[PDB]
Amino acid sequence: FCGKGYHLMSFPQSAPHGVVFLHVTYVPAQEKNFTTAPAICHDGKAHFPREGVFVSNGTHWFVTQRNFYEPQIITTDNTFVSGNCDVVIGIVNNTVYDPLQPELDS
Amino acid sequence: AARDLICAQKFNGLTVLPPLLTDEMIAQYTSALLAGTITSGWTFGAGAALQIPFAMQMAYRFNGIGVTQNVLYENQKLIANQFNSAIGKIQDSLSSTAS
Numbered sequence: 376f377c378g379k380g381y382h383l384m385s386f387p388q389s390a391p392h393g394v395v396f397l398h399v400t401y402v403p404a405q406e407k408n409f410t411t412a413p414a415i416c417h418d419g420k421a422h423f424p425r426e427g428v429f430v431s432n433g434t435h436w437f438v439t440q441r442n443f444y445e446p447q448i449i450t451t452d453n454t455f456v457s458g459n460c461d462v463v464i465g466i467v468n469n470t471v472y473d474p475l476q477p478e479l480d481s
Numbered sequence: 482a483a484r485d486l487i488c489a490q491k492f493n494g495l496t497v498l499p500p501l502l503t504d505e506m507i508a509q510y511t512s513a514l515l516a517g518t519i520t521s522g523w524t525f526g527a528g529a530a531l532q533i534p535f536a537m538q539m540a541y542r543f544n545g546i547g548v549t550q551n552v553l554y555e556n557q558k559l560i561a562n563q564f565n566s567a568i569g570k571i572q573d574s575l576s577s578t579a580s
């Protein structure tokens with residue numbers, strides 16, 4: 376509706392017998408391939424990302440947001456549990472870090 | 482032996498100009514749009530096309546309409562069957578009713 380890309384701003388400028396808009400937009404620039412998974416098996420549970428996707432760089436699994444590559448360690452705070460591993464097609468195996476365990480140990 | 486209405490119009494001076502874009506070109510545009518939508522979602526409308534599995538794209542759609550994505554990841558086969566049946570019903574409605 377207002378410029379190609381994700382709209383941020385617009386600025387009106389007058390003109391003879393009309394108006395001119397200066398649409399400001401966000402456009403992604405540099406892509407990168409990753410291997411992605413819909414959910415993760417952990418202790419028989421299926422973890423889904425709260426906001427982001429499960430990507431991997433070949434060895435480890437991280438969770439990012441969709442519009443910018445910001446990898447984060449998969450924990451129980453950025454993921455939620457639903458069901459078991461026998462339903463989701465394409466589920467993978469990975470560990471999910473629990474922040475309470477180090478505090479319990481210490 | 483049978484004079485045509487188009488022949489009469491042509492002889493009387495009313496001409497129909499051809500369109501610039503052919504039907505093959507229009508079909509190429511629609512095929513490109515379909516392939517981009519299927520293989521990238523909305524990302525091809527805001528820059529460069531980003532590949533993504535179609536199950537993940539439908540999970541994005543479900544989160545967009547306010548439904549948790551585990552619904553799709555647990556009813557994927559049922560949803561695919563419903564979509565295929567709806568497409569078949571569209572075909573049957575088009576092949577029978579012309580109005």
Ligand SMILES: *[C@@H]1O[C@H](CO)[C@@H](O[C@@H]2O[C@H](CO)[C@@H](O)[C@H](O)[C@H]2NC(C)=O)[C@H](O)[C@H]1NC(C)=O
Nearest residue numbers: 409430431432433434435436437438446447448
């Ligand atoms: C995938 O990313 C992880 C996280 O950065 C990498 O793991 C670290 O890699 C650096 C060097 O790249 C090492 O110094 C660290 O010791 C690694 N940490 C752990 C916990 O393994 C991993 O190497 C990356 N893999 C690939 C193939 O790029």
Ligand SMILES: *[C@@H]1O[C@H](CO)[C@@H](O)[C@H](O)[C@H]1NC(C)=O
Nearest residue numbers: 405406407408409530531532
């Ligand atoms: C990803 O893989 C495809 C496979 O052919 C390749 O063409 C492409 O250059 C790779 N990188 C990106 C950013 O798509």
Ligand SMILES: *[C@@H]1O[C@H](CO)[C@@H](O)[C@H](O)[C@H]1NC(C)=O
Nearest residue numbers: 463464465466467534535536
């Ligand atoms: C992915 O695509 C391939 C190619 O058709 C197919 O054989 C496979 O079943 C699909 N799913 C998975 C999880 O590999």
Ligand SMILES: *[C@@H]1O[C@H](CO)[C@@H](O)[C@H](O)[C@H]1NC(C)=O
Nearest residue numbers: 416419460465466467468469
């Ligand atoms: C994940 O681990 C379970 C047992 O812990 C195994 O049955 C399953 O095949 C594993 N998944 C994959 C993709 O290897």
